[PDB]
Amino acid sequence: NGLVFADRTPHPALTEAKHQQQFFQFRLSGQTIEVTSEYLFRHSDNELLHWMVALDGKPLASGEVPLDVAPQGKQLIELPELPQPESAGQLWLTVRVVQPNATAWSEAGHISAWQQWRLAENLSVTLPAASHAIPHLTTSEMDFCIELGNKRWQFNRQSGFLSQMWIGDKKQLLTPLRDQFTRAPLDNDIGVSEATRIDPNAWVERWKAAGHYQAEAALLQCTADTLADAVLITTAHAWQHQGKTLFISRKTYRIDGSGQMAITVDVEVASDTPHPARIGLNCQLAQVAERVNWLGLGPQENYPDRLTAACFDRWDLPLSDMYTPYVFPSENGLRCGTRELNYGPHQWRGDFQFNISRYSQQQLMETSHRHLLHAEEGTWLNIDGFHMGIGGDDSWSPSVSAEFQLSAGRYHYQLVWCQK
């Protein structure tokens, strides 16, 4: 039940604890940062504030101000006039409290506190220069195929899914891109439930009883249309268990002359089925690449009810850092509030949560110990429009707060998949 592994390697939760237990509090009003000390006895005599303004991850301005705050006192810091951004996007202010001097308990340069705010946003209005290329639809009995240069997209008409993508003669998928509504259950999802003694109230058991893990997709609709500058695929699936419709997913895929595939997803969740663990897509990519680069919350694992410590910026980690090695394997490594994701030749854009690793949700849920896990062929990608809270108030009764349960009934998200 620790914040750290037995060998004192931190769990991701430790950074959430560090951030919430900060001794300096911040408010922003215009150009002014107000710093409040929660120290009772000490003056801030080993603290300087670093501030940075970045436009979608690109540094614009930064500086340092020494902190001079009495215990329980306040200090106002006036930011200088900021150079206005050169392009569209969201400006972010990040502040960090740094300890210039070493102590008995810390190294020189120790970060003790941080906070972020959104500043001005300039919405992108200038339309991209229309590409001259036009994709071609090849229709057959079993497939809709779209070609553009060395690129090819294959949609199986029997299943309704993007089953394959080609860049040259290279296949990009090991598994079709399919909707996913389940997660390898966390310890909080399971609680005290056991095979020999089922706890019907635990989330995992409600999901199991409702048929969430065994639900089969039935194709309702699969059509193709040619537009002036794009190809449009429309699909609708129903997920059912024992004649009961749990979920309906309606999608459009729009492939244009730039080779960008715009995916729109609209999901209905039956109101009497237990709220699902996630609403997203998944596939097994053929590629194994060294780095994962993303614009979003990070760098560490963060979930919707545990993401206050994570910061919005441009992050770049080795693939292995995107997997959290919990001794009991479960859903892990999610990053939220992500606008762009990069892996090998691929780029995904939108407003999503994701995890990426060599382990499928299926393997994570069937394996009781981390040392028994094996890297699968390629790379498993889970991209979620929505993900349920992880909870934790306790680990023996449902503890995910109502505002983090996926109870809205209808959900919309949108993604653009393209080659970098």
What residue 143 binds from a second copy, Na ion, none (CB within 5 to 8 A, per partner kind)? none
Interacting residues with a second copy between 263 and 282 (CB under 8 A): 266, 268, 270-272
Work out which of 414, 416, 418, 419 binds a second copy, going by CB under 8 A.
Answer: 414
Bridge partners, residue 230, by sequence:
256
**Is residue 266 within 8 Å of 303, Cβ to Cβ?**
no
Q: How far, in Å, CA of 250 to CA of 5, rounded?
A: 42
Q: Is position 223 an interface residue for a second copy (rule: CB under 8 A)?
A: yes
In sequence order, the 6+-apart residues with CB closer than 8 A to the CB of 58 are 314
**How many angstroms separate the CA atoms of 131 and 133, rounded?**
6
Q: Measured from the CB of residue 110, what is the shortest distance to Na ion in angstroms?
A: 13
Contact between 36 and a second copy per CB under 8 A: no
Q: Which is nearer to Na ion, 47 or 301 (CB)?
A: 47
Q: What is the C-alpha to C-alpha distance for residues 352 and 310, in angstroms, rounded to an integer?
A: 15
**Residue 27 in contact with a second copy, rule: CB under 8 A:** no
Binding mask 178-217 for a second copy (x = CB under 8 A): ----------------------------------------
Q: Is 1 annotated as a binding residue?
A: yes
Distance in angstroms (rounded) separating the CA atoms of residues 403 and 268? 18
Contact 252, 232 (CB under 8 A): yes
Residues that bind Na ion (CB under 5 A): 47, 66-67, 329
Q: How far is the CB of 357 from Na ion (least distance, A)?
A: 14
Which of a second copy, Na ion, none is residue 329 near (CB under 5 to 8 Å by kind)? Na ion
Residue 188 labelled as part of a binding site = no
Identity of the residue, 194 or 403, whose beta carbon is nearer to a second copy in the bound complex: 403
The strand pairing partners of 342, in sequence order, are: 293, 347
| Closest CB 22 distance from Na ion, rounded Å | 16
**By the 8 A CB rule, do 292 and 229 touch?**
no
The answer to whether residue 416 forms part of the interface with a second copy (CB under 8 A) is: no
Phi and psi torsions of 187, nearest 5°: -55, -40
One-letter amino acid at 400 equals V
In the complex with Na ion, which residue's Cβ is closer, 67 or 309? 67
Query: Which is nearest to 280 in space by CA: 203, 334, 358?
Result: 334
Q: Please report, as residue ranges, which positions from 243 to 262 form the binding site for a second copy (by CB under 8 A).
A: 244-245, 248
Burial class (CB in 10 A: 0-12, 13-18, 19+), 11: middle
Query: What does the alpha-carbon distance between residue 330 and residue 328 come to, in Å, rounded to a whole number?
Result: 7
118 is a contact residue toward a second copy (CB under 8 A)? yes
- Min dist CB 135 to a second copy, Å, is 14
CA distance 414 to 266: 9
Under the rule (CB under 8 A), what is the footprint of a second copy? 90, 118-123, 125, 127, 220-221, 223, 225, 227-228, 232, 236, 238, 240, 244-245, 248, 266, 268, 270-272, 351, 410, 412, 414
Binding-site residues from annotation for substrate: 1, 396
Binding residues for Na(+) are 1
